[PDB]
């Protein structure tokens, strides 16, 4: 699936 990078 699409992804927009690491989060916190």
């Amino acid at each position: 699936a699409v992804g927009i990078g690491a989060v916190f």
Partner: antibody
Framework: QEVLVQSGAEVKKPGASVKVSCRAF????????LHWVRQAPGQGLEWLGW????????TTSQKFQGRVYMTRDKSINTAFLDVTRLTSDDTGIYYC???????????????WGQGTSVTVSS | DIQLTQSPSFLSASVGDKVTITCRASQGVRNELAWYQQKPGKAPNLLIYYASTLQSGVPSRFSATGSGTHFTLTVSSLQPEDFATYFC?????????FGGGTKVEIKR
């Protein structure tokens, strides 16, 4: 507890810009990607784009690229949507919606704001 | 883009009925598919993700199946609160898109 609260209804004239806000409560704002989705009256759902609230990185639907802009202010747990160069086709309800974001990818939109009505007219 | 086609667009049923609604994708989306319920004046609510997994708090009478291009959502026995519009959505590639919705109305 986990909720998104959006700014109130707006009217703008064609060619102008509208800025709508969405504030996260009851969870860590920077922990989930956030989508913007709109619904024209009587119509279905249209994805505008999404933002990573931690990094600020965005991906915009190419139909809206350079026209719709997503930003965030982490200090106030708030995301913003700027829809510019407005036309009557932009009339509708605008939602922010959190992604579950399992595996740092899109999974499903589990918390939705209440929506912001935007009317574009002269 | 990938197009999601839902059928039927309008489903008539009675309280207590078992019904199944269909979502077809124009290209393969694997399991990367979600279902939502929406009622007039309200934001959608997430029902299903990963094509078959129930979202927390959703009643067990909801279930869903499929992979690739063909997906279904089933309500085992409809209750009055289930008459609503249902949407499918894929996230397999950009742009994210939704199906056109299936509105479930009560027979009388």
């Amino acid at each position: 507890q986990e909720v998104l609260v959006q700014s109130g209804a707006e009217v703008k004239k064609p060619g102008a810009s509208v800025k709508v806000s969405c504030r996260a409560f009851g969870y860590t704002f920077t922990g989930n990607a956030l989508h913007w989705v709109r619904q024209a009256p009587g119509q279905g759902l249209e994805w505008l784009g999404w933002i990573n609230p931690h990094s600020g990185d965005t991906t915009t639907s190419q139909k809206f690229q350079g026209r719709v802009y997503m930003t965030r202010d982490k200090s106030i747990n708030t995301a913003f949507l700027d829809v510019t160069r407005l036309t009557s086709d932009d009339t509708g309800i605008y939602y922010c919606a959190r992604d579950k974001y399992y595996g740092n990818e899109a999974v499903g939109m589990d918390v939705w704001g209440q929506g912001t009505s935007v009317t574009v007219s002269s | 883009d990938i197009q999601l086609t839902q059928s039927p667009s309008f489903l008539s049923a009675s309280v207590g009925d078992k019904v199944t609604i269909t979502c077809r994708a124009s290209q393969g989306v694997r399991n990367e598919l979600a279902w939502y319920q929406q009622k007039p004046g309200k934001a959608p609510n997430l029902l299903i993700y990963y094509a078959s997994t129930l979202q927390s708090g959703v009643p067990s009478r909801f279930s869903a199946t499929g992979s690739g291009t063909h997906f279904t959502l089933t309500v085992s026995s409809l209750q009055p609160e289930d008459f609503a519009t249902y949407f499918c959505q894929h996230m397999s590639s950009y742009p994210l898109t939704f199906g056109g919705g299936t509105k479930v109305e009560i027979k009388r």
